[PDB]
Ligand binder design. Structure first.
Ligand SMILES: *[C@@H]1O[C@H](CO[C@@H]2O[C@@H](C)[C@@H](O)[C@@H](O)[C@@H]2O)[C@@H](O[C@@H]2O[C@H](CO)[C@@H](O[C@@H]3O[C@H](CO[C@H]4O[C@H](CO)[C@@H](O)[C@H](O)[C@@H]4O)[C@@H](O)[C@H](O[C@H]4O[C@H](CO)[C@@H](O)[C@H](O)[C@@H]4O)[C@@H]3O)[C@H](O)[C@H]2NC(C)=O)[C@H](O)[C@H]1NC(C)=O
Ligand SMILES: *[C@@H]1O[C@H](CO)[C@@H](O)[C@H](O)[C@H]1NC(C)=O
Length: 199
């Protein structure tokens, strides 16, 4: 009887865990019909892990659960079924997403200010500190204040989209039309922007 896989679908597209619950991911491979399963990461056999747990079904399907997900866990995870063996490949990629949020116009001691917060979620890498930039604009001027937000090491874990971590804050003082434009925060090789517009 020919052995085939009904899941996961045959694809080379990247696969990412849902960032609302990014601490764990379950990868399941199932046979088309009613087995022994082997799991590999880049062709290397995965018991000894304690964050990679493999559980068979009550044998037509096998599931690999990765707990304590961190950015370094990204790789090609393959499930091989046998009674020619059939192998399915999951290209598990772990994104880092930057988000720049604005407080809007805020009055501080009679002066209007705007506070932009650089937030991240997903799987931080701790490879590049947050950096603020703005085209045609010197952010080292007196009208701007940059306040880093010192957080714990995030590269060993994950950050849920429901609980975003603020990394830095840029405050613009005495808002005028000349302050309009894009403000970008770049973290860990990723970036996000917010456009200040008084219109
Ligand atoms: C096992 O093999 C894995 C695959 O290896 C690749 O394929 C083989 C055939 C070889 O050619 C090998 O050289 C290839 O790398 C391998 O996993 C791969 O690791 C690389 C490097 O870590 C990953 O590249 C990075 O991926 C992340 C994640 O992308 C997602 O998130 C971003 C947003 O954050 C989205 O935009 C994407 O669409 C994805 O949703 C990227 O963020 C990252 O980009 C940043 O870094 C690069 C390089 O520094 C910069 O140029 C960019 O501008 C960004 O700053 C990289 O693209 C690759 O995704 C990953 N492939 C997988 C998991 O399939 C793994 O390392 C090998 N070893 C082990 C032990 O697993
Ligand atoms: C904003 O305007 C107030 C009032 O004129 C002034 O006291 C304050 O120093 C100004 N802020 C900056 C950053 O120049």
């Amino acid at each position: 009887p020919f052995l085939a896989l009904s899941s996961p679908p045959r694809t080379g597209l990247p696969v990412s865990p849902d960032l609302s619950q990014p601490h764990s991911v379950t990868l399941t491979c199932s046979a088309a019909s009613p087995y022994q399963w082997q799991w590999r990461r880049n062709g290397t056999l995965l018991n000894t892990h304690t964050r990679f747990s493999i559980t068979p079904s009550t044998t037509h399907s096998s599931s690999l659960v990765i707990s304590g997900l961190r950015y370094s866990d990204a790789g090609d995870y393959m499930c091989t079924v046998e009674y020619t063996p059939v192998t399915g490949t999951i290209h598990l990629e772990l994104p880092l997403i930057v988000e720049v949020d604005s407080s809007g116009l805020v009055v501080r001691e009679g002066s209007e200010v705007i506070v932009l917060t650089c937030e991240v979620y997903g799987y931080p890498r701790d490879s590049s500190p947050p950096m603020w930039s703005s085209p045609g604009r010197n952010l080292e001027s007196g009208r701007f204040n940059i306040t880093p937000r010192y957080t714990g090491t995030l590269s060993n874990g994950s950050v849920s989209s429901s609980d975003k971590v603020a990394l830095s804050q840029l405050t613009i003082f005495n808002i005028t039309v000349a302050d309009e434009g894009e403000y970008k925060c770049s973290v860990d090789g990723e970036s996000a922007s917010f456009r200040v517009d008084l219109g």
